[PDB]
Symmetry: C3
């Protein structure tokens, strides 16, 4: 909760509204290599985190990090290309700042994407995992974006997370994947957040396996938590960018961004899939 004040969020939201003709319904957070979704926008309007009032700037990426407003397959959007991570030194109340303002912008849904490691054996690099649940490791210890005094204007003190990833949207995505006639099916599993920049050891990969994680990553969870606090509908996917060596074996899949079509294609498929899913996100106009 800390760091910002309610008026901070209000001021940042008003600046945006007074600077963009766009009134977003959907907010989309792009993971690594997934930033290309911005190219699918019509009537796009770009914003530098930098020029937006209380918006945290990027530590190094910067240009990789910007806010784009536009239209994606029927929905008014605002995509965040280049998300914040706590390993970059960002306290969780900064990492989630966007979501809080997106809420005060009118966004009622948040689709989140992230690149992850494959813990579940059946996954194979290139795969896309529809996120059904999560294990918040940083949270178990105090690293929860909601730590601090709660603001009832945003939500409750003890919000439930057992129902964060929308079942309706999850069944809708499951159907849509079938509808597309996709060869390999849409995977679905538990995501485990782990901070720190460095990569896991076989010993650690095995405890995550034990804990029941299907994919491991260093983001998403905080943003999802505050989104739910605001009452926003939340759903997302994880792009498996490498299988995880859980057995004392020779290293492999070191790089993930420079992997040719292995990345390119897989990222490409998720980005379009997400666009098609815009037709499945309930219009605020109570469409039936």
């Amino acid at each position: 909760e800390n760091g910002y004040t309610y008026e901070d969020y209000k001021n940042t939201a008003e600046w945006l509204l007074s600077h963009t003709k766009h009134r977003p319904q959907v907010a989309i957070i792009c993971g690594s290599g997934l930033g290309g979704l911005t190219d699918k926008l019509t009537q796009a309007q770009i914003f530098d985190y930098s020029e937006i009032p209380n918006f945290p700037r990027s530590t190094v990426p910067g240009h990789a990090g910007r806010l784009v407003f536009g239209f994606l397959n029927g929905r008014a959007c605002v995509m965040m290309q280049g998300r914040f991570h706590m390993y970059e030194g960002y306290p969780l109340w900064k990492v989630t700042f966007p979501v809080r303002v997106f809420h005060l912008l009118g966004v009622d849904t948040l689709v989140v994407t992230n690149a992850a490691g494959g813990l579940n054996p059946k996954f194979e690099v290139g795969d896309i995992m529809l996120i059904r649940d999560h294990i918040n490791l940083p949270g178990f210890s105090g690293q929860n974006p909601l730590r601090g005094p709660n603001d009832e204007r945003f939500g409750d003190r003890f919000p439930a997370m057992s129902d964060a990833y929308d079942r309706t949207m999850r069944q809708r995505a499951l159907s849509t994947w079938k509808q597309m006639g996709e060869q390999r099916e849409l995977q679905e599993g538990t995501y485990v957040m782990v901070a720190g920049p460095s990569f896991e050891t076989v010993a650690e990969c095995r405890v995550l396996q034990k804990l029941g994680a299907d994919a491991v990553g260093m983001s998403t969870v905080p943003e999802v938590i505050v989104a739910r606090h605001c009452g926003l509908r939340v759903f997302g996917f994880s792009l498996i960018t490498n299988k995880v060596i859980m057995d004392y074996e020779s290293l492999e899949k070191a790089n993930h961004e420079e992997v040719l079509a292995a990345g390119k294609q897989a990222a490409q498929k998720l980005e379009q899939f997400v666009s098609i899913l815009m037709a499945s996100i309930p219009l605020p106009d109570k469409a039936s």
Copy 2:
């Protein structure tokens, strides 16, 4: 350890001694809905955390948070109605400040209570679990109230916790419950501390189960740790306010305070039980 200085504790203890005629032997920390224990006090003297010198004030509850000195079933007490939690933004050295001063007040025993979720299947809401052990999740990562330079005037650098919950007092409570002729028996199990305001997900509830936790909560453990550091006898109970859905099922037991007699009665029974147990806490006068 950080934040306060030894003289801070001494100054706060002396202020209390010079402001209350009471010389407490027992300190009792009330969990949620368990604050009614204060009504069982004779010759009660109320203090606002606010007016006590270095005492951390409440973020919002405030009035729910106050220090009451009195007499409970034969013992001189000081009950803390409305405890501090780290999810409220309190660093652990503030959350435990009370215990440290209680020590310099003469308190040689600390009974702690907390409301928790039922992880062990056999538990049923309303149940009371005698705490036999704990799993300190925030501590495994650095969140231990003792982090910082150790003060030998309070205790050692590496205090043992494998024996925090008194076996004598635990057998005494086990007997007393029988003595009362209580229908359902006194449950006993491991408590798992988890920070953060939000509630667990099925995925997370399952790892706690795996870890061997019988009840989950967001407090108690830090206070217990510093109490042991001071050498105080420690024992407590957990009031199961809801069973935990560890299987992909529809939500339930959202509310806990507004649950009619479900809360009322169960809280009522624990409060009296604790009073009866005052007769079991060893008098400093080496009674035999």
Copy 3:
């Protein structure tokens, strides 16, 4: 990463170079009771963390903490007697500061030692465990020395840890132990870092067991992580100073430093073993 700046490291390294005629190839970090290794140095030159420019001073130990440059069995060394721990209040970027400067000193290898508790049943106090892997509990939550913006001059953003403990050096130590004709064999297993000054409870010791930890301690891991970031060859051992009671049993092995020959001898054997291993650390001169 935080706290210091690159020039801070450069300035501290230059001060050392301009104050010592020694040009260390190997850096050795001594655990508890293992500080006697300093006595095996020839042409030793002592430094007080205190007098070295940005070097964090000791909270209490102080005199137990000093930097000694000398020669050990063929290698130019710099031993750190009295390491920093996060439970002492040191942020991880201070705990690892040494390693970062050791790198800018020319050190291409780091041998780390620590005293630990025995989780694996087959271990028996006195035993020495060659570290093959680790489980970074503080890291899973944000406590990773690399948190903050990454410096490419030291290393990458996402360094791999699945290969931190050198297999070559691990097989070399395995051979050397045999070569010595040692009675009991060299143990090898996973080390689990746990912060906080206090000791584990049976409940907690059982989760570590479940997690697959063979030894538990409150150090080593951070130093290893930054060493790898710098690209240094890393290897180390853990001296089992007490078996861990993972079953509800009477306490035992409280003390570890005051345990007569139990400590003395075991520490003695590890210290010499480490010296013999100097002959196994690859000379920068591409010896073949």
